[PDB]
Design an enzyme around this catalytic site. Sequence first.
Site, PDB file in Angstrom:
ATOM      1  N   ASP A 170      19.154  13.524  -3.127  1.00  0.00           N
ATOM      2  CA  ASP A 170      17.897  12.821  -2.841  1.00  0.00           C
ATOM      3  C   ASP A 170      18.038  11.948  -1.598  1.00  0.00           C
ATOM      4  OD1 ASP A 170      15.488  11.614  -2.830  1.00  0.00           O
ATOM      5  OD2 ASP A 170      15.720  10.574  -4.763  1.00  0.00           O
ATOM      6  N   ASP A 183      12.220  13.095   2.504  1.00  0.00           N
ATOM      7  CA  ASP A 183      12.495  12.826   1.097  1.00  0.00           C
ATOM      8  C   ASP A 183      12.768  14.135   0.359  1.00  0.00           C
ATOM      9  OD1 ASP A 183      12.737  11.684  -1.370  1.00  0.00           O
ATOM     10  OD2 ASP A 183      10.593  11.235  -1.609  1.00  0.00           O
TER      11      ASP A 183
HETATM   12  C1  LIG Z   1      18.873   4.511   2.975  1.00  0.00           C
HETATM   13  O1  LIG Z   1      18.184   5.492   2.379  1.00  0.00           O
HETATM   14  C2  LIG Z   1      16.934   5.248   2.003  1.00  0.00           C
HETATM   15  C3  LIG Z   1      16.267   6.306   1.437  1.00  0.00           C
HETATM   16  N1  LIG Z   1      15.043   6.176   1.043  1.00  0.00           N
HETATM   17  C4  LIG Z   1      14.369   5.044   1.170  1.00  0.00           C
HETATM   18  C5  LIG Z   1      13.040   4.910   0.697  1.00  0.00           C
HETATM   19  O2  LIG Z   1      12.360   3.920   0.970  1.00  0.00           O
HETATM   20  N2  LIG Z   1      12.571   5.906  -0.074  1.00  0.00           N
HETATM   21  C6  LIG Z   1      11.284   5.978  -0.740  1.00  0.00           C
HETATM   22  C7  LIG Z   1      10.208   5.147  -0.536  1.00  0.00           C
HETATM   23  C8  LIG Z   1       9.085   5.336  -1.295  1.00  0.00           C
HETATM   24  C9  LIG Z   1       8.987   6.295  -2.280  1.00  0.00           C
HETATM   25  F1  LIG Z   1       7.864   6.403  -2.978  1.00  0.00           F
HETATM   26  C10 LIG Z   1      10.072   7.146  -2.521  1.00  0.00           C
HETATM   27  C11 LIG Z   1      10.048   8.271  -3.611  1.00  0.00           C
HETATM   28  C12 LIG Z   1       8.790   9.083  -3.489  1.00  0.00           C
HETATM   29  N3  LIG Z   1      11.125   9.200  -3.353  1.00  0.00           N
HETATM   30  C13 LIG Z   1      12.239   9.197  -3.968  1.00  0.00           C
HETATM   31  N4  LIG Z   1      13.228  10.122  -3.620  1.00  0.00           N
HETATM   32  O3  LIG Z   1      12.516   8.352  -4.991  1.00  0.00           O
HETATM   33  C14 LIG Z   1      11.569   7.442  -5.523  1.00  0.00           C
HETATM   34  C15 LIG Z   1      10.618   8.398  -6.168  1.00  0.00           C
HETATM   35  C16 LIG Z   1      10.176   7.592  -4.974  1.00  0.00           C
HETATM   36  C17 LIG Z   1      11.185   6.927  -1.734  1.00  0.00           C
HETATM   37  C18 LIG Z   1      15.047   3.968   1.729  1.00  0.00           C
HETATM   38  N5  LIG Z   1      16.297   4.092   2.134  1.00  0.00           N
END
Ligand SMILES: COc1cnc(C(=O)Nc2ccc(F)c([C@@]3(C)N=C(N)O[C@@H]4C[C@@H]43)c2)cn1
Length: 379
Positions: A221, A34
Amino acid sequence: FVEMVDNLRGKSGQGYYVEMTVGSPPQTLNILVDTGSSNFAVGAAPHPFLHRYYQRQLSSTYRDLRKGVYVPYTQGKWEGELGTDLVSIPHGPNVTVRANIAAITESDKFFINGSNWEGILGLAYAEIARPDDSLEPFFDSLVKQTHVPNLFSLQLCGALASVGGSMIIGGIDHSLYTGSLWYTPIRREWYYEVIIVRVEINGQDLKMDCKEYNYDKSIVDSGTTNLRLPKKVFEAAVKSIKAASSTEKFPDGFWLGEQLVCWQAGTTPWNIFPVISLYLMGEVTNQSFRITILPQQYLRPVEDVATSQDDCYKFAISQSSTGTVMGAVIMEGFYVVFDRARKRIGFAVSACHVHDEFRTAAVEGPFVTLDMEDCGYNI
Ligand SMILES: COc1cnc(C(=O)Nc2ccc(F)c([C@@]3(C)N=C(N)O[C@@H]4C[C@@H]43)c2)cn1
């Protein structure tokens, strides 16, 4: 860095994860990569959706920081107990470092039912670390305690179908991309913040004040699926995308992400959907470059549609109140170098991006763009 090629896995829409170990003896966990957050946080209790979890009682190198932290997101949250322990990346550099770990003890809408990851590796900077910027992020610890160079690169390979890719820790693997890398400055080290200077749909400039493109920020991101755009920018982009694809009409709900559109197998009309180009601030005064994605990036397959027998897709460009987010819709088109040492982010055409016989994702430069500093948002 051949050891690190293909070290990412995932399922479509569920994120890209890398294998890591925590504790002594090492406890293996799958960890979401992430670049949009800065905490290393792992499940530490038997949530029913978790394949496994960190068991601090088994680690002789665990050290308790006697501090907790509560981390709410727009939808979801986790709460954890802070500590440190030895961390390594098996398909990464041959090193072990003492890093902060948030042992997650309660959560809501954070872990994904059916996913194969148990934690998150926030790769952004300490300014957005929770609870505060004194909690050193993992990559900072890695670089401080070892000779690993201060950069990493991500190749996210899209198309529940299995995804993959590579996180090259401490360097670049030139086999993962074609052409040249083109670099845009990291405006500020909190998120991986960048500045978009121009937007085109099938080569047609949206002609907005470029400040709108970065209101209130633009970030790279890997932890967001969509290309998210500021509301005003979203409106103009959808209007132009609708006009370019007007040989076929779709319900308003499709463009708003409120319903899918499905086509007969193998009959998706890629050609009627336009390419999308973001011009990024270049390394040199008045110099920019552009990255271009295809509908194969922003029309994403939805495979778990039980009530349909066809090939259904989600429109994965959406409106935002937190600025532009260059998520997987962008990153799946490119090899992305997070050159922390030189405060810049490099883009090149990904050797694994999805395309067809008529169009490919592209990274092209140089272009002449004036007044690019005015594109950045300030309070
Ligand atoms: C196909 O690409 C993807 C990319 N990511 C995911 C995904 O589940 N991400 C995910 C899950 C939980 C979460 F808490 C976060 C936080 C910490 N991070 C980010 N950047 O943003 C939001 C602030 C939240 C992200 C799924 N599919």
